[PDB]
Amino acid sequence: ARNVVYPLYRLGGPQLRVFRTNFFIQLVRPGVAQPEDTVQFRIPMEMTRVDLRNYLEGIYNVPVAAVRTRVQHGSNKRRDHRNVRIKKPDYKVAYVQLAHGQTFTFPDLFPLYSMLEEERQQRQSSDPRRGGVPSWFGL
Amino acid sequence: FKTEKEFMQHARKAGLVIPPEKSDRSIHLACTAGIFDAYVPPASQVSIRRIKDYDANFKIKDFPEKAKDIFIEAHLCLNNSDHDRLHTLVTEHCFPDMTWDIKYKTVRWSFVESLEPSHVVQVRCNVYGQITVRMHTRQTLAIYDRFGRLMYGQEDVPKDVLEYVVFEKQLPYGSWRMHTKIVPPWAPPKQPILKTVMIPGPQLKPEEEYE
Amino acid sequence: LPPHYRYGMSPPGSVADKRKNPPWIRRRPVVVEPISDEDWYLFCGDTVEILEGKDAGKQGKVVQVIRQRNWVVVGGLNTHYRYIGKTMDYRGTMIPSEAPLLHRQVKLVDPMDRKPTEIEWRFTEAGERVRVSTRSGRIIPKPETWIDGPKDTSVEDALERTYVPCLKTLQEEVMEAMGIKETRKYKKVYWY
Amino acid sequence: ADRMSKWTSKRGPRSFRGRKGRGAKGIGFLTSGWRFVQIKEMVPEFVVPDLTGFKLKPYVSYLAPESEETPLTAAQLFSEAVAPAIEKDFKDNLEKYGFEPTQEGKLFQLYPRNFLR
Amino acid sequence: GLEEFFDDPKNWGQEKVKSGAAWTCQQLRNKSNEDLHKLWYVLLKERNMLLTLEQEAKRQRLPMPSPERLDKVVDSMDALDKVVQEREDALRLLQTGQERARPGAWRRDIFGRIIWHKFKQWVIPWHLNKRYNRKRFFALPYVDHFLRLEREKRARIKARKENLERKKAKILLKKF
Amino acid sequence: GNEYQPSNIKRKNKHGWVRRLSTPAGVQVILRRMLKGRKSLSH
Amino acid sequence: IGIRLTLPPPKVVDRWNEKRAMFGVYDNIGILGNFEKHPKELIRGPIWLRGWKGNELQRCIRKRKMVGSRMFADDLHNLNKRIRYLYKHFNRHGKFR
RNA sequence: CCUCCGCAUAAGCCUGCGUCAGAUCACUGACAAUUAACAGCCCAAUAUCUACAAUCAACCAACAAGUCAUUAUUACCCUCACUGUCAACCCAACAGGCAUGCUCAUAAGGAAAGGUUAAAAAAAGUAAAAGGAAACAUCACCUCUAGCAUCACCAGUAUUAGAGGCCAGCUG
RNA sequence: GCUACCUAAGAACAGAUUUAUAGGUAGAGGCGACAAACCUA
RNA sequence: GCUAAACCUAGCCCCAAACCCACUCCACCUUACUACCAAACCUUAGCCAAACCAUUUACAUAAAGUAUAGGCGAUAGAAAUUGGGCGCAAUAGAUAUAGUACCGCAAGGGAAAGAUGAAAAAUACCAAGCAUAAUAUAGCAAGGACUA
Ligand SMILES: [Mg+2]
Ligand SMILES: [Mg+2]
Ligand SMILES: [Mg+2]
Ligand SMILES: [Mg+2]
Ligand SMILES: [Mg+2]
Ligand SMILES: [Mg+2]
Ligand SMILES: [Mg+2]
Ligand SMILES: [Mg+2]
Ligand SMILES: [Mg+2]
Ligand SMILES: [Mg+2]
Ligand SMILES: [Mg+2]
């Protein structure tokens, strides 16, 4: 869990166990070309590599084999109207290599107007032969 | 741009995510996108019942008299440019189509006596009554300019006008207002214009030719 | 939303609002009078009657209540006319848009008399508070299906009292139910 | 030369960047030769149940009624949890009923906590 | 598997998904602790689903199908976590009588102000903790002047706010 | 004008919160920044 | 051009307000209510200038000794500097002596 | 055609010529990236050991005298986490500066000329008849002070320490 | 964080050298192969 | 006719009254914002006035500027006793839209600015400066004038 005080372990003590997990996770699409067995996540900052291994093993039954993380610096270079820097938040990225010869490809997610569109078909733009004269009149 | 697809594709290429938000108020329209049944000119007592069950004091034998006064008085509101009466007299599908191109020029329409009696032709039908009327009148026009020089029509001389005017009523406080004006495909061309027109050909970039 | 944000006909976070109220404007705030929450008596859907301006006397229906400016949008009344859908070379369409109304300019309507009546909040034996008119003791009531998807609990399973109130932790109860048995005893640390 | 920016781990010389980290928790400790020993017991085990046959979906149908918020005070939890056992054993040593004076012998101590969340 | 990060493959691109209500608290106070454990993991996996769907929604430059059910799932995780904390707190009041799960003490730092100090776990006792004894939980007498200065800055801000509220009230009585 | 020749060790060791709190005069520096209202009391 | 183009909103002045219609009442509470109160006990204001008129140096001296112990810290400091300035001004500077 | 530049690490900076879009001698918004083996981040006590420079270390050759080490007993069995990783970049100037390793003209990096004319004056470069200038410190020395030990002098002891003084030739 | 001297542990090409890094000395002061120089224009 | 102009209302000031604040979770004196190992008090000085300076030099009412002190000079000076707005209204009023931007190694210094309407789900005329409209012998550029 995150934003929780962990209890201190003394040598010979019990197993540290988390029962309700605080931190979420989201698997993003890779922005570059990556191997077929690598799944890229956005871990939250406090989640270690080992927590991510047991997180996907326990909750999702994913056979995880390697995990490699990079912390991404979001830019502090964009300002308000007040000339005050906005920070896009930093985030950790997990790169997960799945075991047993399995392979993940990111799926193809995302594969009254009658009145408007039925007057956009009855537009009847002005004739050039009419020379600017309004054609409402029956004369 | 030219349509909504161009703006949404440009907003997707740019990154403008416009979330479609849920609002309890919508647009309370009082008109129709065009005509219910296109009366093509040379048994609809169903819709007369479907009008009298809402209105219940409605004589068709008096209505083309009323349709005359809805017509003529609305056209006199062009002689003064009185738009606030036109919104009582004309629908909102009909208001721009008669007042937009006439802006920044003076018109001097006038009515003189009808050749025929005006007579109702058909009647059709949250509920929109729609009554097409045949009028065979004699009218006078003079459309001037910003500069006050005549660009359409002799002012004295009356001309004989056929008018298949479609009226519409909302079916609480509304009334019969001019909705459209059918012009038949057999109709003769209108008055010619006092000026001459050049109509351009294809503007050729150097890589293409005229053929 | 910033301080002295100006409310308007648009909702407070839409695209048209962010065109109208960008985060750097500062305008003269509208002096609205204080109407308490107990004392607001126009609800979405009430048939009302307009007292001032155009469409005076006409009886419409409240569609939106913009409560921060003491506003009532009587749907179909107090209309001006705006175009919509205006492209580069099409003039759009003429549409009857509605300008709002202050709550002073609007009175409610008896459903048996159809008259502009003052409304006082009397109390009742059946309901603690409800509106009652003045020209008659008449209760004007507050005005105004579903199939479950694959990821909704039905009302049966959502309301089963499966909770036996005990003196155990969620942690201890899950340790018992999951069959986890912990032999190592916890060793006392210092807190300071 | 910045003061407004947050002092993060990306920012110092090598000796600074190695020490400061993100909010991650220590799992083991360093030993000689800079060899990290990982302790199995400090790593959290996600105790995750079996979801088979489980009838609670993430949303509630709209047909369910509205109820009133009654937060669980200790008077309520004493009443339903303890009060029938005291009414039964009074019509016919408080540790009998689910009370513990100390909890230094206890695994999940309530003050101060040793469980997580 | 990883297909639990994605919803039903029939819903892909439908731009509107019928979702039910959120869990309110009183619906969840009827559920046992084992059942709130399991519902925590149901909502947990659903929340990871919706967060992948947001980030792919920003990636493809498209709007979300229905962003409301993310608000509902955060709503339910908040209500469920609040219920579980209520039962931990009521059991803590019965078994020990404390109110904070974590110990602390009202202390008074170098800067003179009174702060709730949250205790940390340590192994060695405090008197031979070398880093704990470099912290000063006492204010020397050169601080009490700044305490008076801070006191008066807060009293100025409060007086300005109260007076300004009365001026707005006078403008309301002149206008109405 | 290249008088500022930067390093982070000299910046934190010169002007950081720990050196500011190490002396009574530096604690008064912090208290005056806290009373002027500033966003950065130190490096 | 620092002059306004539209003439301002009108100044509605109610001469028969509560305050204006009852202005001046109990100014003669001494001389025709048996001298039980003085009219200076009718004025409301700062506690150091209820029924006292002085120039600025005297208002500052009297403010310091009558309320100065519970003045704010930098207001008391500004006021001691004002008495120190106004002392050095009235006593050492001027035309007539 | 230049290349006295480059490429990496260090320090610094902190997303700052990635893609999509748009406004603007001719930055804004969205999205994506930097993946640890390199480098940081180390070490169980208590005692006790550590006379023989480096220089191809061999002779030689020295003085200014030097950069590198354990053992005894006790305790000790888990293991690969965390952080850095991008760029056309930093400090200045509105010229300059910058540690180190390699490459020593480059396999790497770049462009002195917006277009024209070919005035003066100015700057720089090349050519030019005949002539060919038309005080302190301090070795050394002297003087004075100082017989002494755990924060300088000094882990030194009067051979010490401190303070003083001293023509021919060429050339715009 | 310049600059002056110093210290620690370095480096480079021949030293009364040059230099990177971190530390020390602070204004009645410091520091000075003493220019009554320099000590963030 | 461009540039611009205008605009009231954010807020503020002075009183009165009243004695204020401060643990969602986490982190925060180590290089603050970092889960976890062997000691506090010690006369203010001076500026300035004395036309220099050197002792000296202010920090309810009434007695009373009295007694006193004092290079008996500048000056200082008791006691007994007595008993909401004839505010500001965007160069103002707060520095404040913010202790932010920016500047500084740091202590520290410290900005500027907004104005539609009931609804935006309705998109005039006036500063200097120019432009319309360059110039005509001669001269503090005007005055007397003059048909000009
Ligand atoms: Mg890494
Ligand atoms: Mg390594
Ligand atoms: Mg690199
Ligand atoms: Mg190249
Ligand atoms: Mg050129
Ligand atoms: Mg020559
Ligand atoms: Mg003097
Ligand atoms: Mg007295
Ligand atoms: Mg101001
Ligand atoms: Mg200001
Ligand atoms: Mg002008």
Nucleic strand J under 7 Å from the C-beta of G24: no
The answer to whether residues G68 and G62 touch, using CB atoms and an 8 Å cutoff, is no
CA of E77 to C1' of H102 (A): 59
Chain C interface includes B203 (CB < 8 A): no
Best residue of D2, D3, D5, D6 to probe chain F, by most F CBs closer than 10 Å: D3
Quick check: helix, strand or coil at residue D116? Answer: strand
Asked if A114 contacts B33 with a C-beta cutoff of 8 angstroms, the reply is yes
Q: Which residues contact C169 (CB under 8 A, 6 or more apart)?
A: D108, D110, D115, E33, E88, E91
> Which position has the token pair 């849920």?
B22
For residue C94, how many other CB atoms are within 10 A of its CB? 21
Residue of A nearest to C91 (CA): A123
Long-range contacts from D1-7, C-beta under 8 angstroms, 24+ separation: D1/F4, D1/F6, D1/F11, D3/F39, D3/F40, D3/F43, D4/A85, D4/F39, D4/F40, D5/A76, D5/A85, D6/A87
Q: How far apart are CA G4 and CA C63, in angstroms?
A: 42
Nucleotides of I under 7 A from a protein CB: 1-2, 21-23, 40-41
| Domain assignment of residue A51, given as a range | 1-139
Q: How far is CA G6 from the centre of its chain?
A: 36
- With CA of F29 and C1' of each nucleotide, the nearest comes out as J107
Handedness of CA B112, B113, B114, B119 (dihedral sign): positive
Which residues are CB-neighbours of D22 under 8 A, at least 6 positions away? A45, A46, A71, A92, D9
Q: Give Cα separations from C33 to C1, C40, E171 (angstroms).
A: 21, 12, 10
Q: Tokens 């990636």 label which residue?
A: E59
DSSP code per residue over E52-70: HHHHHHHHTTPPPS-THHH
Instruction: Tell me G8's DSSP state.
Output: P
Tokens matching residue G75: 């207001």
Tally Cβ neighbours within 10 Å of residue C46: 22
Strands (E), chain B: 110-112, 119-124, 128-140, 159-170, 177-182
Note whether C129 and C123 are within 8 A (CB).
Answer: yes
Query: Measured between alpha carbons, how far is B92 from B86 in angstroms, rounded to an integer?
Result: 9
Instruction: Identify the burial level of B90 via C-beta atoms within 10 angstroms of its C-beta, where 0-12 means exposed, 13-18 middle and 19 or more buried.
Output: buried
- Ramachandran region of residue B138, left (φ > 0), alpha (ψ -120 to 50) or beta? beta
Residue of E nearest to G70 (CA): E152
DSSP E92: H
Strand C71-75 with C59-66, pairing: antiparallel
Work out the minimum CA distance from D20 to partner chain F, whole angstroms: 14
DSSP structure class, residue C89: S
- Alpha-carbon distance of E77 to A21, in angstroms, equals 11
Q: From the CB of residue D57, how many other CB atoms can be counted at a distance below 10 Å?
A: 22
Assigned token pair, E125? 């006792």
Task: Give the closest residue to J36 (Cα–C1′).
Answer: E122
Long-range CB contact pairs, A29-33, < 8 A, 24+: A29/A106, A29/E56, A29/E59, A30/A106
User: Strand, coil or helix: what is E42?
Assistant: helix
> Helix, strand or coil for residue B161?
strand
Structure tokens at E40: 């925590």
Distance separating alpha carbons of residues C133 and C117, to the nearest angstrom: 6
Alpha-carbon distance of E67 to E51, in angstroms, equals: 10
- Domains, chain F, with CATH or none: 1-43 (1.10.287.3980)
Q: How far apart are CA C75 and CA D86, in angstroms?
A: 64
Other CB atoms within 10 A of residue C93 CB: 20
Q: Is residue B202 part of a domain?
A: no
Cβ–Cβ under 8 Å, residues C48 and C72: yes
The resolution in Å comes to 3.0
Strands D45-46 and A17-18: parallel
Given a contact cutoff of 8 angstroms between Cβ atoms, the answer to whether E33 and D72 are in contact is no
Nearest by Cα to E101 from B207, D80, D51, C191 = C191
State which H helix or E strand residue E46 sits in.
helix E33-59
Per-residue buried b or exposed e for B47-60, using 16+ beta carbons within 10 Å of the residue's own CB? bbebbeeeeeeeee
Tokens 């500033």 sit on residue: F38
Phi first, then psi: what are they for C169, rounded to 5°? -75, 165
Whether C and G touch (3+ CB pairs < 8 Å), yes or no:
no
> Distance from residue E114 (CA) to nucleotide J20 (C1'), in Å?
14
Are 3 or more Cβ–Cβ pairs between D and G shorter than 8 Å?
no
Pick from C35, C38, C41: nearest CA to C134? C41
Look-up: residue for tokens 């892909």? E12
Report how far Cα D23 is from the mean position of its chain's Cα atoms.
Answer: 17
CA dihedral G45, G46, G48, G49 (to 10 degrees): -40
B96 domain-assigned: yes
Question: How many angstroms separate the CA atoms of G30 and G23, rounded?
Answer: 17
Do D59 and E21 lie within an 8 Å CB cutoff? yes
Residue E176: count of CB within 10 angstroms of its CB = 10
Residue that has been written with the tokens 């995780």 in this structure: E77
Q: Which residues of chain E (6-45) touch nucleic strand J at CB < 7 A?
A: none
Contact at CB, D107 and C185, closer than 8 angstroms? yes
CB contact under 8 A, B18 and C15: yes
**CB atoms near residue D17 (< 10 Å):** 14
Count of structural domains within chain A: 1
B190 domain residue, yes or no: no
Distance from the B5 Cα atom to the nearest Cα atom in chain A, whole angstroms: 13
Q: Evaluate whether C83 touches C97 at the Cβ level (below 8 Å).
A: no
Please state, in angstroms and rounded to a whole number, the distance separating the CA atoms of residues C76 and C98. Answer: 7
**74-103 on E, CB < 7 Å from strand J:** 99-102
CATH number at residue A63: 3.30.70.330
- Single out the residue of E125, E79, E121 nearest to residue E103, CA to CA: E121
Q: Sort B123 into a burial class: Cβ within 10 Å, 0-12 / 13-18 / 19+.
A: buried
Tokens encoding E36:
């709130």
Q: Is D115 helix (H, G, I), strand (E, B) or coil?
A: coil
C153 contacts D99? CB cut-off 8 A = no
Q: Phi first, then psi: what are they for C69, rounded to 5°? A: -120, 15
Query: Cβ–Cβ contacts within 10 Å for residue B111, how many?
Result: 17
In terms of C-beta density within 10 A (0-12 exposed, 13-18 middle, 19 or more buried), how is residue A41 classed?
buried
For E99-130, b where at least 16 C-beta lie within 10 A, e where not — what string?
A: eeeebeeeeebbbbeeeebebebeeeeeeeee
Q: Do the beta carbons of residue A83 and residue A74 sit within 8 Å?
A: no
> In Å, how far are A92, A106, B146 from A42, measured between CA atoms?
6, 14, 66
Quick check: G74 contacting E, CB < 8 Å? yes
Interacting residues of G52 by C-beta distance below 8 A, sequence separation 6+: G62
Counting as contact any 3 or more CB pairs under 8 A, the partners of A are B, C, D, E
What contacts D77, CB < 8 A, 6 or more positions away? C165, C167, E87, E90, E91, E94
Residue C162 makes CB contacts below 8 A (sequence gap 6+) with E30, E31, E32, E35
The answer to whether residues C170 and E33 touch, using CB atoms and an 8 Å cutoff, is yes
Phi/psi of residue G27, nearest 5 degrees = -85, -25
The residues of the protein lying within 7 Å (CB) of strand I read F 1, 3-7, 9-11, 13-15
Which amino acid appears at position G64 of this protein? Answer: R
- Counting CB pairs under 8 A, whether chains B and G reach 3 or more, is no
End-to-end CA distance of chain A: 81
Render the burial of A93-120: b for 16+ CB within 10 Å, e for the rest: ebbbebeeeeebebeebbeeeebbeebb
Rounded CA-CA distance A45/C181 in Å is 32
Q: Which residue is nearest to nucleotide J94 (CA to C1')?
A: E160
* 3-state SS, residue E117: strand
Q: Which two tokens stand for residue E91?
A: 């059991």
CB interface of E with D, residues 136-175, below 8 Å: none
Distance F9 CA to I23 C1' (A): 11
Mark yes or no for CB contact A42/E48 under 8 Å: no
How far is residue B72's CA from residue A15's CA, in Å, rounded to a whole number?
93
D112 touches chain E (CB under 8 A): yes
**Shortest Cα distance from E155 to chain C (angstroms)?**
22
Give CA–CA dist B135/D99, Å, rounded. Answer: 97
Q: What does the block give as tokens for A19?
A: 């029962």
Q: Answer for the pair B17, E56: CB distance below 8 angstroms, yes or no.
A: no
What is the residue range of B113's domain?
4-182
Q: Which CATH number do you get for residue B71?
A: 3.10.450.240
Residue nearest to nucleotide H82 (CA to C1'): D21
Instruction: Report strand pairing: B110-112 vs B128-140.
Output: antiparallel
CA distance A6 to D75: 30
Which nucleotide lies closest to A11 by the C1' atom and the CA atom?
A: H78
Is E119's Cβ below 8 Å from some Cβ in A? no
Nearest alpha carbon to residue E13 among E73, E72, E69, E66: E66
Residues of E in contact with G72 (CB under 8 A): 152, 155-156
In this structure, the number of other CB atoms found within 10 A of the CB of residue A52 comes to 20
| A134 interfacial to chain B (CB closer than 8 Å) | yes
**CA of B207, C1' of H117: distance in angstroms:** 38
Crossing angle, helix E33-59 and helix C170-177, to 10 degrees? 100
Evaluate whether E92 touches D78 at the Cβ level (below 8 Å).
Answer: no
